[PDB]
């Protein structure tokens with residue numbers, strides 16, 4: 001008699017010791033509904049089609065309609081043929097302080113966007129599909145959750161894994177913040193100034209695609225900063241105490257925090273910003289880098305010893321990873337095995353499970 005009767009013959013590197021971190025897909029619940037077979041994921045308790053083709057089939061592909069002829073259709077309208085209303089002859093950008101008359105429906109739609117960030121994202125924001133092109137973005141569950149937390153909490157710290165598409169959500173969040181709030185100065189901080197310029201560029205792209213009624217008039221449009229007619233702005237900087245002390249930000253966004261050398265002095269300088277009577281917002285996102293400064297920030301948040309709300313999302317947040325090479329749902333069994341085998345458990349734990357190398 002070899003291994004017992006009812007013991008699965010498939011093993012996974014992640015279950016390297018008595019601890020089952022990933023359950024075999026054959027043990028999951030299954031059901032038939034809507035004419036197809038479904039399997040329940042162990043990661044979120046949600047149902048997924050057995051076939052990747054159906055997973056793709058069930059997603060809506062809607063292009064961002066190009067409408068520059070019918071104002072009545074204000075939701076998709078952008079007056080780019082009339083370069084008089086344009087900024088620097090730019091067809092996608094709206095000109096500042098331009099007197100415009102609105103209808104009742106337009107005011108309500110604008111308010112709806114101001115108060116429902118998720119609705120704003122999936123109705124007026126996009127991503128570039130490989131073959132379909134520029135279409136409206138359908139947020140991943142973690143992106144929807146992240147957007148909601150960043151908007152509802154004054155300070156948020158996100159411990160994320162790599163390649164989750166987080167820049168897309170950050171861009172939408174910043175675009176939303178400056179478009180629906182007045183006189184708010186936003187500062188983007190990163191290890192290198194070039195990194196912050198990239199975040200700013202992604203945010204500029206989102207604003208550019210917005211219809212006339214949602215897009216604020218453009219006052220300034222540089223590679224290092226922008227200013228809108230509502231008085232809000234965004235600037236890209238290299239993290240340092242001087243960058244923090246040198247401006248009065250309503251919001252500071254820090255990119256890849258755990259990989260910023262000597263961040264401690266920047267963190268120190270941010271304490272007065274946090275405790276200021278102006279109630280500034282602070283958003284931090286990063287993947288782990290051992291037991292350094294970020295580990296301390298994260299731990300305080302998780303233990304409730306700071307004003308920061310913690311948020312985390314790991315590798316299984318990207319659902320395409322839950323289908324194998326034969327386009328069959330396997331809850332990420334194969335993807336994780338190949339990723340670990342192609343690197344190592346240590347690298348996978350840090351890079352994809354958001355674990356802190358600096359062991360407990």
Ligand SMILES: Nc1ncnc2c1ncn2[C@@H]1O[C@H](COP(=O)(O)OP(=O)(O)O)[C@@H](O)[C@H]1O
Nearest residue numbers: 127128137138139140143163164165166167168
């Ligand atoms: N909800 C989504 N639906 C479809 N594609 C997405 C989504 N979020 C991100 N992406 C795509 O993932 C790609 C890489 O993500 P990006 O936003 O650059 O962040 P990161 O580089 O950290 O993954 C982008 O080209 C983007 O089009």
